Design a protein around this ligand. Sequence first.
Ligand SMILES: CC(C)(O)C#Cc1ccc2[nH]cc(-c3ccnc(N)n3)c2c1
Length: 297
Amino acid sequence: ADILPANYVVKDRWKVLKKIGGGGFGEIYEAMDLLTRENVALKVESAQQPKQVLKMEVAVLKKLQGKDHVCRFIGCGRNEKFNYVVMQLQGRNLADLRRSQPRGTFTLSTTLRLGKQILESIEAIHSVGFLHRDIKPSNFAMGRLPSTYRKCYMLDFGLARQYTNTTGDVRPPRNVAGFRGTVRYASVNAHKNREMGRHDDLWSLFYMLVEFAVGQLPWRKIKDKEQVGMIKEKYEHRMLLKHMPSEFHLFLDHIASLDYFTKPDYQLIMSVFENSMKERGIAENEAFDWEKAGTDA
Ligand SMILES: CC(C)(O)C#Cc1ccc2[nH]cc(-c3ccnc(N)n3)c2c1
């Protein structure tokens, strides 16, 4: 069934406690690090599996080491049965935290402050020549330590693609590129099976923040890829912002203006979040909604 059993020790060092995630791609375990005495995340991929994707995931994670909002890399390896990566263990993902909120909504305070962090992570992965291509709330996790629990960390590079060649140029888009990310947060371009660009990661961010602040997207009950693309294509997006800060029109109009070839104005989007906080007197060091101060006073 699973690749690693319960109590399996990888490289004499990382001992499986339980499976915390998995699909077609590979599986993710919580492990005890026998050297450091710390719990770690262990992600594994079958050595035979026809698509060898973990190799690319580790390469991305390694390039990003030293950026904020990135899991600390601990180790990786390869044998006859599986490839694996060991990374610092984070806490709960934003989909789990949003569904724990009484109405499935975050405050503007939580929404805007998570937005700044996710924006920073998107620019970071773009800055080392990669698209995420599956930006969604379950791919961000809060830290679990006193130094990290107010930090949001980007996970799961399993659908990432290098958008540059080996010498830093933007590579030519394929005329058709089959979109295989999550329906709910996919850009209209993704829905049309266009080559995805940096802008398409920022669309996914746009839709996440609306959904955080409002509790839902208009197409939430529709799972069909094609039906959802047809709804988004027609949807008057300025209407998503009816109950959002007016600065979010600057965000919408910007990413609407972008194409596959054009570098986003990340600072423009950051200033939207920053101006939206400043207008409502929102301080950076406020409790997140899920904290004792956040779930109380
Ligand atoms: C960055 C990389 C190597 O591509 C990755 C991943 C990934 C995918 C799916 C996952 N599901 C849950 C986690 C997870 C949970 C807690 N703490 C950490 N570091 N992860 C998780 C991590």
